[PDB]
Motif scaffolding. Structure first.
Motif, PDB file in Angstrom:
ATOM      1  N   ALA A 283      10.590  27.914 -22.297  1.00  0.00           N
ATOM      2  CA  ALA A 283       9.604  27.735 -23.358  1.00  0.00           C
ATOM      3  C   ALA A 283       8.253  28.306 -22.948  1.00  0.00           C
ATOM      4  O   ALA A 283       7.637  29.077 -23.693  1.00  0.00           O
ATOM      5  N   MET A 284       7.775  27.937 -21.757  1.00  0.00           N
ATOM      6  CA  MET A 284       6.506  28.474 -21.281  1.00  0.00           C
ATOM      7  C   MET A 284       6.592  29.976 -21.055  1.00  0.00           C
ATOM      8  O   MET A 284       5.601  30.690 -21.247  1.00  0.00           O
TER       9      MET A 284
ATOM     10  N   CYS B 154      -3.665  26.778 -29.007  1.00  0.00           N
ATOM     11  CA  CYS B 154      -3.582  25.409 -28.511  1.00  0.00           C
ATOM     12  C   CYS B 154      -2.378  24.680 -29.095  1.00  0.00           C
ATOM     13  O   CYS B 154      -1.689  23.938 -28.384  1.00  0.00           O
ATOM     14  N   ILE B 155      -2.109  24.874 -30.388  1.00  0.00           N
ATOM     15  CA  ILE B 155      -0.967  24.210 -31.010  1.00  0.00           C
ATOM     16  C   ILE B 155       0.333  24.689 -30.379  1.00  0.00           C
ATOM     17  O   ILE B 155       1.230  23.889 -30.083  1.00  0.00           O
ATOM     18  N   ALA B 156       0.458  26.001 -30.164  1.00  0.00           N
ATOM     19  CA  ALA B 156       1.660  26.532 -29.534  1.00  0.00           C
ATOM     20  C   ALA B 156       1.809  26.010 -28.112  1.00  0.00           C
ATOM     21  O   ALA B 156       2.915  25.658 -27.684  1.00  0.00           O
TER      22      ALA B 156
ATOM     23  N   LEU C  23       4.607  22.437 -24.420  1.00  0.00           N
ATOM     24  CA  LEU C  23       4.549  21.365 -23.432  1.00  0.00           C
ATOM     25  C   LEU C  23       5.403  20.178 -23.861  1.00  0.00           C
ATOM     26  O   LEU C  23       6.060  19.546 -23.026  1.00  0.00           O
ATOM     27  N   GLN C  24       5.404  19.858 -25.156  1.00  0.00           N
ATOM     28  CA  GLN C  24       6.289  18.813 -25.656  1.00  0.00           C
ATOM     29  C   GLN C  24       7.748  19.180 -25.419  1.00  0.00           C
ATOM     30  O   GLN C  24       8.549  18.339 -24.994  1.00  0.00           O
ATOM     31  N   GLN C  25       8.112  20.436 -25.690  1.00  0.00           N
ATOM     32  CA  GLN C  25       9.480  20.877 -25.439  1.00  0.00           C
ATOM     33  C   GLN C  25       9.831  20.765 -23.962  1.00  0.00           C
ATOM     34  O   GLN C  25      10.939  20.344 -23.607  1.00  0.00           O
ATOM     35  N   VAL C  26       8.898  21.137 -23.084  1.00  0.00           N
ATOM     36  CA  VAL C  26       9.149  21.058 -21.647  1.00  0.00           C
ATOM     37  C   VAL C  26       9.345  19.609 -21.222  1.00  0.00           C
ATOM     38  O   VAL C  26      10.241  19.293 -20.430  1.00  0.00           O
TER      39      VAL C  26
ATOM     40  N   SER D 284       8.531   9.489 -24.655  1.00  0.00           N
ATOM     41  CA  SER D 284       8.277   9.233 -26.068  1.00  0.00           C
ATOM     42  C   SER D 284       6.797   8.980 -26.322  1.00  0.00           C
ATOM     43  O   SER D 284       6.229   9.487 -27.299  1.00  0.00           O
ATOM     44  N   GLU D 285       6.153   8.196 -25.454  1.00  0.00           N
ATOM     45  CA  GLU D 285       4.732   7.920 -25.626  1.00  0.00           C
ATOM     46  C   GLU D 285       3.904   9.185 -25.456  1.00  0.00           C
ATOM     47  O   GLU D 285       2.936   9.397 -26.190  1.00  0.00           O
TER      48      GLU D 285
END
Lengths: 346, 414, 266, 318
Positions: free
Chosen positions: A35-36, A55-57, A62-65, A127-128
């Motif tokens: 992803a990165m 920033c959104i991407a 980072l969420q995917q990672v 999750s948090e």
């Protein structure tokens, strides 16, 4: 580095677009997360160039990672994740220099990760973290533009001639929301080479129904006499009151002041950095120099510019505007002066 | 060899009908100035040394307008020659007659009398001759196309075309229109023989400017049922080669219908055809001088602008036109000798010479020809064309697309 | 309405009482007579209509903000604290006047009068130049009240502020309302004096209380609401032409007022 | 004969649609040659009649192109020469035509030597380890810069012109001689102009009050120079001085097709979008610091005397 840099800009990296960093890497990327890897490839190829889009991407990657991150035994995750995310940020910076928004976002993410205690489970922590990223985005990017849209609606009058520059996801939204409320004005879109990103705002306005105009920045002194307001967007607000934005902003504000036109600035609170800057020489960004090549007439004059060892090609991106040329700043907190950035930072 | 061209100052096609009944198509005032003037200026500016003007429909008016014009003066470097005849029925007949008279010698240009362009043809003409000199008697024609967007208002469906040419050497392999058709067909011969570098182009504006060769007229005499240029190309492609030349920094367009007329007008007023602009006065006329000001507002002599009226966008006022008080005119072309009332809204309206508009009239996207007249409390809708010398009574509201003419069968009579 | 009756009562009983202080006093007096918030907003509009000044509107906004058993207590304390704002500003501003300096003052204002009365009490000597303020001859009243204190006052012409600017060591003017960006809403003849003072590097001081902070941000002379101007009566002065500010909260810079307002959140 | 008429018509037509001689020096030379031609072979028996004919021809040439304020200067110079040569004899008409050609030839020699006279003052304004910022492409400025590189070492910054990127050609021609040039866009004229020390630029013409008509973007450059208190030298010969004053200047800027600013292939947004492309702009005199000509450097506050010495106040309107 690619090509010969300038003597006064020899302390900054000058990368290229054709030279990809994924050549010396495994197709299934082992050391770097896929992803990165694709995010850095997009940043290098210019697929994502918006201040907020970048920033959104980054946050989505980072969420995917984090979604597919396994904590090894023999150690806590609150520190392992922070130690693992550093090489990813280094690789991203190697692909393309990071922006103030990305810096603040990674800082907030590191702080949130450090705020996670080893007392909690792994799934709950992930999750948090995901929910925190989501709500932080919604607050500082989505909800941070609805208040600025209704605050600048007061300073917009019927018959106004607003002048904008470049491409900004907030200025276009402000104008499109003010046009639908009942205001009837006309916009002047200024653009500069080689990005020519103002055409994005031009098209977004034409599709909305707002009378718009288009002209290059060298002719800004000719149309400003008829301009009533200058609405500009920036990438970061320094702690010394100055404004960091596209290279064609400082001179625009200067000419506006010379023509006695009030200049405005719209930025989100999350773009309020803590550093300071006095000029565009200490910290800037040099993009690929071949972008200046232009098909003018029958042939190009800078086709083999590297053969001339004395010729340099400067391609600055950002610039720093002094607080002496900015009148008002629009944020979600309200209308504040240009010299009140530290107060908001507090 | 001096460059020579042939000008067909008559379009046997009748699209401006009813308007083409009283006054030719090629003398319709676009921006206070005829179309044949634009075409002659383009030819004189591109390097043409001699022209042959062919006219069948209302040729007397064309010639007696040209003989006062500046191109027929002894001080003009492009000597023009008017050949009038009542037998001509299509472009093919004109080319047949040229072959019968042996007027042309070398590479000549074939353009209509309603083409507005500022394109320079030196480059394309060199390419044509060099290409013919590498393959003797192989290349026969070179069609000039202007690359545009399929979204542009100037691209009407009636003229829209799609081409499939070779990219190695610009060469037309297939050419067909797209009027009322949704999926295009391209035969397999293109890939059968050659053209490794073949590609389909849909982003092109047909300027109707072609650098022809005497062999074109020869083949036109051979095939008797070639009635136009499009059929010449289709019948030659079934079988000589036809090539192109694409321009990206120059303007060119042909006025074929009414929708096309209002598209070039905005561009000409907006300086898209520089140097050809109303400010330049490229006719050497005394009744067309103007002064260009901000927002592309052109004002002539004796404009008599009333207090209160606001010119907001690209408008062109004529010499002698009278404007009232508290008016609103924008994107509108006003002719010389017009006279407006009070509280008059004009939005994308084209008023020719001798028009009078009463007070309280609201006209939007409609064209008023010579000697038109409308009374008070009249509102005209988009595409509501009035021809010569009509009078519209007060308190009338015309529907959209309404056409009023003094000839009984032309349209809804006065 | 009896609201206007009480307002005129407080204004006539005390001649030197400011308009905003009287408005807040009337509001607190009527508070003794949710639903309450609209009731108050209504009182503030009528009062604002009777006297069109920025001070009354600022005071009303501040009072309502204070309103968001305990309110009577807080309001009495606030009134008593704001009563001594004049002395708090004087004790801090009268020290900036040195012997042999020439003063240039605008139309009559009770605060600058108090500051000068406190300065002369400290065994000091200076000269003053008061502008006539043609709109209403209040500058002559200021010159009279000053000469009554044995000080060499001198009335100047409204168009001579630029002629005597070189003979002035500093400028001390009042303010009807301090805008968020540090600017000031003062008499119509104030923006032209500040420009000359800046053109000749003359210290342009401003004296104002704390109840004059208003959540306004005018970009020019047009952004000012017409209800305050009505030949306009007031004008806006940019903060770049102001040197310092003397308020009951202490000597402030043109930027500290924005911080204070942000802390207060309107 | 009518060969003169056809030559005049060709000149006017060349000035009408596009540019003729590329260099302003060549334009002035051609204009002076055409004036000498119309003067030498013509039926004229007085001075006032020749003045009227010259005024008519100059009016025609100016109406052909108002932004080309170089033909009017030559017409006014010829008028002044005729007036002076007539007053020298009246204050007659025996051999005036003989010395008129001599004066025109002297003016031609001056126009030929003006470039060398201007380029000789390069070292008097450039020192070692200096940085110079310019804009556009000007042959006079190019010569002024390359005349000092042979004895000094400086850093030349060149700002391109967005509509017609002609600064690239200047940067290339300069770097061909080893001057350590640089290329950049117009947007980077203020953020980068903090380490610059001197500015040397050209102009299309010099107005009466010291102002001038330069290429687009020069106004921002002058504003930045005045904000940073940097000198602004203007390398312009004498023929670029116009007696006209800054009237409300509607025909001041040269508006060209919007194809350069916005291409035709954008789409359907071109019908509801007004694009303007002004080539020239107005530069006030307060932002200027010096004027280098073929007669020595002068200040903007002294151009009125040069005008009074060049043109007659009666021929200002022509």
């Amino acid at each position: 580095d690619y090509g010969s840099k300038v003597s006064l800009f020899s302390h900054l990296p000058q990368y290229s677009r054709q030279n990809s960093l994924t050549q010396f890497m495994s197709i299934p990327s082992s050391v770097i997360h896929p992803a990165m890897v694709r995010l850095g490839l997009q940043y290098s190829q210019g697929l994502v160039s918006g201040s907020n889009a970048r920033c959104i991407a980054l946050l989505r990657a980072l969420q995917q990672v984090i979604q597919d991150y396994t904590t090894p035994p023999n150690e806590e995750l609150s520190r392992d994740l922070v130690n693992k995310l550093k090489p990813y940020m280094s690789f991203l910076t190697q692909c393309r220099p990071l922006s103030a928004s990305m810096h603040n976002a990674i800082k907030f993410l590191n702080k949130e990760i450090t705020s996670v205690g080893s007392s909690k489970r792994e799934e709950e922590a992930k999750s948090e973290l995901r929910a925190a990223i989501d709500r932080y985005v919604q607050e500082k990017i989505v909800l941070a533009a609805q208040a600025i849209s209704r605050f600048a609606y007061q300073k917009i009058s019927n018959g106004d001639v607003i002048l904008v520059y470049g491409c900004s996801s907030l200025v276009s939204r402000i104008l499109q929301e003010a046009w639908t409320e009942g205001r009837r004005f006309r916009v002047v879109v200024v653009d500069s080479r080689p990005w020519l990103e103002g055409r994005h705002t031009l098209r977004s306005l034409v599709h909305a129904g707002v009378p718009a105009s288009y002209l290059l920045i060298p002719a800004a002194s000719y149309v400003l006499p008829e301009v009533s307001k200058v609405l500009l967007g920036a990438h970061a607000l320094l702690a010394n009151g100055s404004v960091m934005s596209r290279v064609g902003t400082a001179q625009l504000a200067l000419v506006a002041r010379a023509h006695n036109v009030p200049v405005l600035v719209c930025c989100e609170t999350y773009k309020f950095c803590e550093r300071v800057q006095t000029d565009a020489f200490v910290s800037n960004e040099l993009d690929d120099p071949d972008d200046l090549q232009c098909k003018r007439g029958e042939h190009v004059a800078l086709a083999n510019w590297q053969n001339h060892a004395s010729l340099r090609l400067l391609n600055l991106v950002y610039d720093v505007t002094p607080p002496e040329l900015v009148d008002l700043v629009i944020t979600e907190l309200g209308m504040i002066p240009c010299s009140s950035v530290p107060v908001v930072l507090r | 060899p001096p460059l020579q061209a042939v000008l067909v100052a008559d379009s046997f096609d009748r699209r401006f009908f009813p308007i083409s009944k009283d006054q030719p198509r090629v003398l319709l005032p676009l921006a206070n100035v005829a179309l044949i003037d634009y075409t002659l200026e383009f030819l004189t500016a591109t390097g043409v040394q001699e022209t042959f003007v062919f006219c069948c429909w209302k040729a007397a008016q064309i010639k007696e307008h040209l003989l006062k014009s500046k191109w027929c003066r002894p001080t003009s470097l492009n000597v023009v020659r008017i050949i009038t005849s009542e037998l001509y029925r299509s472009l093919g007949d004109v080319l047949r007659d040229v072959d019968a008279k042996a007027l042309v010698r070398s590479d000549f240009l074939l353009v209509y009398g309603d083409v507005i362009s500022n394109i320079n043809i030196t480059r394309a003409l060199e390419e044509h001759r060099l290409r013919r000199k590498l393959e003797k008697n192989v290349s026969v024609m070179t069609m000039i196309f202007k690359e545009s967007s399929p979204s542009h208002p100037t691209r009407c469906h009636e003229d829209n075309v799609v081409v499939a040419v070779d990219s190695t050497t610009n060469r037309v392999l297939h050419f067909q229109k797209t009027q009322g058709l949704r999926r295009f067909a391209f035969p397999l011969s293109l890939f059968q023989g050659s053209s490794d570098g073949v590609e389909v182009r849909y982003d092109l504006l047909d300027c109707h400017i072609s650098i022809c060769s005497p062999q074109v007229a020869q083949l036109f005499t051979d095939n008797f049922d070639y009635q136009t240029r499009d059929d010449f190309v289709r019948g030659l492609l079934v079988n000589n080669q036809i090539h192109m030349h694409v321009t990206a920094k120059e303007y060119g367009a042909r006025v074929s219908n009414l929708h096309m007329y209002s598209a070039v007008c905005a561009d000409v007023i907006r300086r898209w055809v520089y140097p050809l602009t109303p400010e330049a006065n490229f006719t050497d006329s005394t009744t067309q001088s103007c002064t260009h000001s901000r927002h592309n507002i052109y004002r002539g002599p004796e404009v008599s602008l009333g207090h209160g009226s606001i010119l907001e966008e690209n408008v062109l006022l004529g010499s002698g036109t009278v404007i009232g008080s508290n008016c609103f005119i924008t994107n509108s072309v006003i002719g010389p000798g017009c006279h407006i009332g009070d509280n008059v809204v004009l939005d994308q309206t084209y008023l020719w010479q001798g028009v009078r508009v009463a007070a309280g009239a609201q006209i939007h996207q409609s064209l008023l020809c010579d000697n038109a007249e409308v009374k008070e409390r009249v509102t005209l809708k988009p595409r509501s064309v009035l021809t010569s010398q009509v009078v519209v009574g007060p308190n009338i509201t015309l529907p959209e697309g309404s056409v009023i003419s003094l000839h009984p069968p032309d349209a809804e009579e006065d | 309405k009896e609201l206007i009756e009480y307002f005129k009562s407080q204004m006539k009983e005390d001649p030197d009482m400011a308009s905003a202080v009287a408005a807040i006093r009337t509001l607190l007096e009527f508070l003794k007579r949710q639903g309450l918030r609209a009731n108050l907003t209504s009182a503030i509009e009528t009062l604002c209509g009777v006297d069109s000044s920025v001070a009354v509107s600022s005071g009303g906004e501040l009072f309502l903000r204070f309103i968001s058993k305990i309110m009577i207590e807080r309001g009495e304390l606030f009134l008593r604290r704001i009563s001594l704002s004049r002395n708090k500003i004087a004790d801090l501003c009268h020290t900036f006047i040195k012997d042999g300096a020439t003063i240039l003052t605008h139309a009559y204002s009770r605060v600058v009068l108090r500051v000068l009365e406190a300065a002369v009490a400290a065994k000091k000597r200076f000269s003053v130049y008061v502008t006539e303020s043609q709109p209403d001859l209040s500058g002559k009243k200021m010159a009279k009240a000053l000469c009554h204190l044995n000080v060499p006052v001198t009335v100047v012409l409204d168009a001579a502020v630029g002629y005597i600017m070189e003979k002035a060591d500093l400028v001390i003017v009042g303010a009807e309302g301090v805008v968020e960006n540090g600017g000031i809403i003062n008499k119509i003849g104030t923006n032209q004096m500040a420009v000359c003072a800046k053109a000749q590097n003359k210290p342009f001081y401003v004296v104002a209380e704390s109840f004059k902070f208003v959540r306004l941000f005018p970009l020019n002379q047009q952004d000012v609401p017409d209800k305050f101007k009505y030949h306009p009566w007031v004008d806006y002065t940019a903060p770049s032409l102001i040197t310092l500010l003397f308020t009951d909260l202490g000597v402030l810079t043109p930027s500290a007022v924005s911080d204070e307002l942000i802390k207060l959140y309107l | 004969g009518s060969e003169l008429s056809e030559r005049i018509e060709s000149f006017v037509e060349t000035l009408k649609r596009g540019g003729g001689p590329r260099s302003s020096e060549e334009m002035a030379r051609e204009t002076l040659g055409l004036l000498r031609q119309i003067i030498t072979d013509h039926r004229w028996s007085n001075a006032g009649e020749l003045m009227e004919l010259i005024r008519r021809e100059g009016r025609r040439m100016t109406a052909a192109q108002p932004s080309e304020t170089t033909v009017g200067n030559m017409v006014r110079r010829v008028l002044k020469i005729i007036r002076e040569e007539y007053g020298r004899l009246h204050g007659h008409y025996a051999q005036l035509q003989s010395n008129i050609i001599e004066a025109i030839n002297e003016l031609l020699v001056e126009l030929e030597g003006t470039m060398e006279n201007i380029a000789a003052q390069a070292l008097e304004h450039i020192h070692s380890n200096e940085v110079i910022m310019t804009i556009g492409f000007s042959r006079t400025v190019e010569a002024f810069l390359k005349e000092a590189a042979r004895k000094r070492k400086f850093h030349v910054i060149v700002a391109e012109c967005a509509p017609f990127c002609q600064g690239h050609e200047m940067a290339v021609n300069l770097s061909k001689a080893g001057i350590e040039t640089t290329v950049m866009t117009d947007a980077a004229i203020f953020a980068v102009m903090s380490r610059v020390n001197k500015v040397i630029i050209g102009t299309k013409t010099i107005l009466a009050n010291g102002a001038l008509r330069a290429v687009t973007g020069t106004h921002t450059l002058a504003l930045a120079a005045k904000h940073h208190s940097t000198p602004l030298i203007v390398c312009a010969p004498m023929f670029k001085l116009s007696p006209q004053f800054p009237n409300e200047e509607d025909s001041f800027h040269k508006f060209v097709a919007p194809e350069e600013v916005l291409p035709f292939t954008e789409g359907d947004i071109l019908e509801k979008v007004s694009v303007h492309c002004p080539v020239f702009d107005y530069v006030p005199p307060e932002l200027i610091t010096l004027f280098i000509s073929n007669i020595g450097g002068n200040a903007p506050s002294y151009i009125y005397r040069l005008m009074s010495e060049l043109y007659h106040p009666d021929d200002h309107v022509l």
